[PDB]
Structures are given as C-alpha cells and as structure tokens.
Ligand SMILES: Nc1ncnc2c1ncn2[C@@H]1O[C@H](COP(=O)(O)OP(=O)(O)O)[C@@H](O)[C@H]1O
C-alpha cells in the first residue's frame with residue numbers, strides 16, 4: 039500500500055550538483071507515511087544506478103564538492119512493459135516496480151523532453167511536463183515564438199541559425215533591437231553562453247561563443263526591470279503561487295553548483311499585491327501556452343511602468359530546501375512535504391488520463 | 399572490413415502498426431546491402447521491442463491486411479548512458495552488437511512524436527529524421543499551426559478545444575468564426591484517425607466527443623477548398639524539395655500544375671520545414687486554392703515509406719531512387735549526429 043517513488047537525479051548536465059541537492063531535500067521532505075523512495079542516480083556519464091539511502095552522496099554539505107557515490111548496479115529500461123520496467127543492466131534482474139518517477143535532473147537530458155520520452159516508452163508515470171512542453175520550454179527560440187503568437191509580452195529578438203548567421207549586420211541587429219542586446223544559445227541553461235552586448239566587437243564575440251553551444255542563437259533586446267518569478271502548480275487547473283524576486287548583478291558559470299547561481303532571492307517579492315496578481319495571471323497564461331504539466335517556474339521582467347515581459351519558463355526548477363519554486367509555495371500556504379505529494383498526485387492523475395485514451 | 403549496422407525500428411503500439419510493417423519490409427527489401435547490414439528491431443503491438451530475423455520476421459507478408467510481426471523470443475531493453483551495446487537482452491543482460499544508426503519508421507504515437515527520439519538521444523544512437531522537439535511539434539497540429547502562423551505561412555483558421563474550454567463554444571459560435579464545413583481532429587494522431595467533417599450541430603458534438611477519445615486537445619478548422627498537393631523535403635541545413643504530387647477524387651505524380659506553382663509550393667514546403675526545425679525528411683501536405691494560394695495542412699516527419707508511398711514516389715519522379723533515398727537519409731543522420739557532438743558542453 040505505499041507507492042514507490044523513483045527520484046531521478048544527477049545527470050550529465052552541468053547542473054548535476056544542484057540536482058544532487060534538489061534530490062537530497064526531496065528525500066528528506068517526502069511523506070514517508072505514503073511513499074517509499076528509491077534513489078535513481080544518474081552519473082556524470084549518464085548511466086543510471088539504484089543508490090542506497092544512507093550512502094548516495096559523498097559531500098552532502100558542500101556544494102562545490104558534493105558527489106554521487108559510485109555504484110555496482112547499472113540500470114536498463116524495458117520498453118512497453120507495465121511492471122518491472124527497470125532492470126539490472128548486467129544480468130536482467132528486475133527492480134521492484136516503481137509506481138511514479140520524480141525527475142529532478144535540471145538541464146540537458148532531464149528537462150528537454152528526452153527523459154520524458156524514455157519514461158513514456160516505459161509506461162512510467164512521472165512528475166512534471168511531458169515531451170513537447172519540456173522540449174519547447176528548453177528551446178528559447180520556440181518558446182518565445184509560441185508566446186508571441188499567444189499575444190504575450192516577450193523581449194523583441196531574432197534567431198540566428200547556421201544558414202542565416204551572416205544575413206545580419208551588427209548595424210542591422212542594432213537598428214532592429216536597440217542596445218544593449220543579450221545573446222544566448224537557444225538551448226542552454228544557467229546563463230552559460232549568455233553575454234550582454236553594447237557594441238559590434240562584443241556582438242561578434244557574443245555570437246561565436248553562443249554557436250559553440252547550439253546551432254541556434256537568440257539575440258534579444260535588453261529589458262530594464264526587476265526579475266520576478268512565480269511558481270505554477272497543476273495539470274488542467276493551474277494555480278500560481280505568490281511571486282518572488284531574484285537579483286542578478288553583472289559582477290561575476292563560476293557558481294553553477296549553487297541553485298540560482300547564488301543570486302539574492304527574496305520571497306515574497308516586495309511588490310504591490312495588484313502587481314503580484316498581474317504577474318500571477320500572466321504566469322498561468324504562459325504555462326498554458328507552453329502546454330506545461332505538473333509544475334513550472336515562470337521568470338519575468340517587471341519594468342518601471344509595471345509592464346511584464348516573460349523571460350523563461352523552467353519545467354524542472356531547482357528544488358532544494360531554499361530554492362525559489364518550493365519557497366514560493368511555502369510562502370503561499372503549501373509546505374514542502376505537501377507540495378511533493380501534490381506533484382505525485384498530479385503525475386498519477388495525468389497518467390490515468392493518458393492511459394484511458396484510445397489508440398485505434 | 400565491416401559495414402555499418404542499421405537498426406530499423408518498426409511496428410509499434412499504434413493505429414499505423416501495419417503500415418509500419420510495410421514501410422519496413424520495403425526498406426529492408428531496398429537498402430543497399432553492400433553498404434549496410436540490417437538489424438530488425440520490431441515493436442509488437444504491446445510496445446515491446448524484439449530482435450527479429452530478416453528471413454522470417456513477418457507473417458502474411460504478402461497480404462496488406464493480416465500482415466503481422468512474427469512473435470520473437472528475445473525481448474529488448476535499452477541502457478542509458480552507454481555509447482556502445484546500448485541494446486541488451488531484457489531477460490539476461492546480453493548485449494546486441496552495437497548498432498551504428500537507427501532508421502525509425504514507427505508512424506504515429508510513440509515513434510513519430512518525439513518519445514522514441516528522446517530514447518535514442520539518451521542512448522547516444524544516431525538516427526534518421528527529425529529530433530525530439532521537431533517531431534513532437536509536427537505531431538501536435540495545434541502547435542505546428544501556431545508556429546506556421548507565427549512564421550507568416552497560411553494555415554486553416556482554427557480553434558483549439560481543451561477539456562476545460564470545450565463547452566465555451568457553441569456550434570453557432572464556432573460557425574460564425576470559421577464558416578462551414580468544419581474539420582474536427584484530435585491534435586495528436588496519425589492518418590485520419592479521429593477526424594470528421596462537420597456540417598451541422600449534431601455532427602459537431604459527435605465529432606468533438608470522438609476526437610477527445612484520442613487526445614486531450616482537439617483542433618476545429620475551417621474547411622479549405624482546393625487541390626491536395628504534397629511535396630517531399632530531404633536534408634538537414636540546406637534542404638531540397640521534390641517535385642509535387644496530387645491526391646485526387648488516386649495519386650498523380652507529378653502533379654499537373656504550372657511550374658511556377660510547383661516552385662511556389664516547393665519553396666513554402668522548405669519554409670515550413672525550417673520553421674518546424676525538421677531534419678532528414680518530411681512530407682508537407684498543402685491545399686492549393688482556386689487563386690493559387692497555398693494553405694499548409696500537415697507536416698509529416700515519418701511519412702509512409704513503402705516503395706509505393708507518396709514520399710518515395712516524389713523523389714523517384716524527381717530523379718532519386720528508393721535505395722539511394724535510403725542511403726542519403728542514413729548519411730544525413732550521421733552528419734547530424736557528428737555536428738551535434740561537436741557542440742561544447744562547457
Ligand atoms: N532581454 C534581456 N534583458 C535584460 N536582461 C536579460 C535579458 N536576457 C537575459 N537577461 C539576463 O541574463 C540572465 C540569464 O538569461 P536567461 O535567458 O534567463 O538564461 P538562462 O536560461 O541561462 O537562465 C537573466 O536572468 C537576466 O538577468
């Protein structure tokens with residue numbers, strides 16, 4: 039009668055270490071009266087392991103050193119099965135069935151739809167957004183096109199590809215978008231490859247760096263404003279937390295082992311309640327437009343005139359004991375343990391919904 | 399020496415299972431046996447993977463109804479994170495010899511919608527066709543249309559129903575917005591699966607309820623009056639468009655249209671292909687109206703691929719034979735995989 043909850047954390051991605059802490063804190067807060075946890079740790083190589091609750095993290099208390107303890111057991115997944123989908127990769131030995139997955143691998147394979155495709159192929163119910171929404175929210179160019187098309191406010195931008203890169207002069211980009219500009223790879227994370235640009239020198243450098251990381255580079259108008267974030271929860275009836283503020287300054291990737299890169303975070307945002315509600319309602323619209331499920335964190339710019347400009351949507355936000363997404367809910371009447379539970383319930387409901395659908 | 403191993407993934411838990419069975423047989427039958435060894439990776443209708451043997455993998459192979467995948471002893475499991483021996487015997491862990499490329503030809507639900515591509519991406523397996531986002535986006539007609547309209551391309555005017563808003567609009571409200579007749583389709587599904595033409599209210603409530611048994615979003619569109627033309631696109635970054643073909647009240651290749659129209663449709667296919675981020679191949683299906691407007695209906699990232707299907711017939715009518723189309727798709731897969739590996743991670 040207790041559901042086995044498989045927490046998938048770690049990963050090849052550069053956010054590996056923040057993933058380890060998100061996992062530690064979920065493991066610590068999860069209602070042990072309803073759920074048994076199984077630790078499904080992914081290596082920096084991308085291989086899956088079943089870790090032991092007592093011995094899974096090597097420097098749990100030390101962000102710049104924390105690590106996932108090596109394992110004998112590697113895992114494989116068996117497509118089309120409905121039980122025992124996860125096995126020992128050396129010998130076929132089955133793991134007991136996991137009833138739901140809680141993926142908390144930030145970035146590269148966990149947030150971009152890839153992991154979600156695998157879990158869908160394994161008939162594993164899972165927390166959060168599915169393939170399309172996850173892939174779409176990770177491609178900044180696509181997400182923005184979807185937002186613009188929904189009528190929502192977005193930084194004016196253009197997208198460079200390998201085949202139009204040189205169509206645009208710096209003058210041309212400057213005439214289109216004004217200065218300063220931000221230049222980023224379409225598919226990254228944690229400001230890696232993001233540069234702000236005030237002249238043609240910078241611009242050309244900016245573009246070359248970003249093309250080291252993706253085949254599409256987004257170049258957008260600089261927005262002046264506070265950075266406000268909001269936590270959305272639900273499937274068909276999305277609810278918005280109160281808003282929170284993040285303060286990033288230009289003075290310092292050299293700290294992508296701390297969530298939000300150690301920026302100043304304050305919850306609730308010291309903004310008026312009617313602005314807070316306005317951002318809340320926009321966050322739900324955004325959520326809807328990107329087809330998100332389970333949860334998402336919506337990050338916006340709030341300009342001097344209280345215009346709200348959507349910057350990012352993150353489908354697997356940081357989930358440490360002091361990360362923005364859970365604190366926002368905690369400030370809104372929903373505690374960590376109960377948040378975790380709600381996320382699991384939503385995952386199982388959506389799975390039931392999907393399963394009931396006809397195939398022919 | 400030794401040739402590239404091509405794993406053809408086919409079959410699947412999908413309405414289009416039998417079509418996939420055929421696309422695969424034709425691919426197996428035509429692939430250049432001097433360059434490639436095929437490994438047959440058949441997915442039964444329950445969605446489980448097997449290694450099949452090419453001398454005896456289909457039952458009633460020659461009969462378009464009754465064609466079935468022969469049941470197999472070996473079921474398969476995938477090992478995330480490995481760059482070799484990613485596919486193993488799911489009973490005992492024995493690895494298959496490592497496949498060099500995957501040719502996915504599972505039409506519809508999991509094979510065409512990004513799920514399979516996401517699995518292949520995690521297994522570091524090079525693969526033919528469009529990647530995770532593009533496959534998922536082209537399969538969701540609602541998203542594909544919104545992206546096409548954002549690019550300035552013509553699509554059928556539409557509304558999208560969800561379980562929460564489906565009762566907002568009356569037949570009368572829809573009709574004032576979109577005219578009659580209407581087409582009601584699940585957002586995500588293959589070939590005509592829950593699609594209905596609607597001319598009155600009873601038809602509408604019926605059609606909408608039906609599409610909602612196949613998906614959680616339903617597109618309701620204005621019926622477009624025109625000829626149905628298709629175009630095959632091939633490539634990654636500098637893609638090429640075949641000559642066009644037509645479906646008639648019957649497939650006609652080449653479509654009997656002036657050259658200017660052929661080129662207009664062709665250039666639009668490529669724009670649609672770029673807007674949706676497709677890779678390898680797609681078939682772009684359009685309506686050509688009385689005044690030569692081109693309205694995009696569908697972008698298919700894994701189109702029917704029997705040697706008689708539209709996509710291959712369009713290339714043949716443009717000077718590219720079926721064996722050679724197969725080879726070019728495999729080498730585009732490999733070129734894309736190498737370009738993706740050159741991207742830096744830090
Ligand atoms: N258009 C913009 N105007 C102002 N600041 C921006 C703009 N784009 C990015 N930034 C700044 O750069 C940071 C990282 O950009 P973002 O697009 O969020 O990248 P990431 O996805 O890596 O978090 C933002 O949090 C913000 O401070």
Ligand SMILES: Nc1ncnc2c1ncn2[C@@H]1O[C@H](COP(=O)(O)OP(=O)(O)O)[C@@H](O)[C@H]1O
Pocket residue numbers: 554581583587588589590591592593619620621622623626695696
């Ligand atoms: N909006 C429309 N206007 C006119 N005819 C349509 C429209 N939508 C669909 N049809 C007709 O119905 C057929 C099936 O719809 P389609 O979107 O092609 O479904 P599928 O993607 O499942 O093949 C089309 O090939 C076309 O003949």
